Curated annotation (Swiss-Prot):
Function: Cysteine protease that cleaves viral polyprotein and specific host proteins. It is responsible for the autocatalytic cleavage between the P1 and P2 regions, which is the first cleavage occurring in the polyprotein. Also cleaves the host translation initiation factor EIF4G1, in order to shut down the capped cellular mRNA translation. Inhibits the host nucleus-cytoplasm protein and RNA trafficking by cleaving host members of the nuclear pores. Counteracts stress granule formation probably by antagonizing its assembly or promoting its dissassembly.
Protein name: Protease 2A
Organism, scientific name: Coxsackievirus A16 (strain G-10)
Enzymatic reactions: Selective cleavage of Tyr-|-Gly bond in the picornavirus polyprotein
Residues shown, of full length: 869 to 1007 of 2193
Active site: H15, D33, C104
Positions with a binding annotation for Zn(2+) 1: C50, C52, C110, H112
Disulfide bond annotation, renumbered to this chain: none
Complex and partners: Homodimer.
Length: 139
């Protein structure tokens, strides 16, 4: 679980979105595993606009933050679940670090702000859905 609150928006993993999120839907993309919904309260999370490949993510399964080196956003294949069939997930970044089901929604941040959220992992890896290209989150 976990979300990004920036201005009048809430960014969550699309597979974890609520009925309220869908009733106030702004944009969603199954290929990215993202959904953005509108909010009445003001969010103060700052989104990074950069090409950083180092950052710190929150890992709920360890209740700890971990520093990581991560790859640049790309199309990477993902297995199958009660949420999606076998597919390539776009705008995905990988890092060597611990993650297990339940860690989705954990924020990844660099010195510039919020980079993305945990969306997949396994075998000593962790995958993050990038949000740095969604320039409209800020205006
Ligand atoms: N982005 C997706 O398609 C996700 C949707 C939820 C399910 N997905 C998983 O990867 C589930 N899973 C299995 C392997 O071990 C893991 C370790 C860390 C994490 Cl965060 C998830 C998993 C795909
Ligand atoms: Zn940065």
């Amino acid at each position: 679980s976990g979300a990004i609150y920036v201005g009048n928006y809430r960014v969550v993993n699309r597979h974890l979105a609520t009925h309220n999120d869908w009733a106030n839907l702004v944009w969603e993309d199954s290929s990215r595993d993202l959904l953005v919904s509108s909010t009445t309260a003001q969010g103060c999370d700052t989104i990074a606009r950069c090409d950083c490949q180092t950052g710190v993510y929150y890992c709920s399964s360890r209740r700890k933050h971990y520093p990581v080196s991560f790859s640049k956003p790309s199309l990477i294949f993902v297995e199958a679940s009660e949420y999606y069939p076998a597919r390539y997930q776009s705008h995905l970044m990988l890092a060597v670090g611990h993650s297990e089901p339940g860690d989705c929604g954990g924020i990844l941040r660099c010195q510039h702000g919020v980079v993305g959220i945990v969306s997949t992992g396994g075998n000593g890896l962790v995958g993050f859905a990038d949000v740095r290209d969604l320039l409209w989150l800020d205006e």
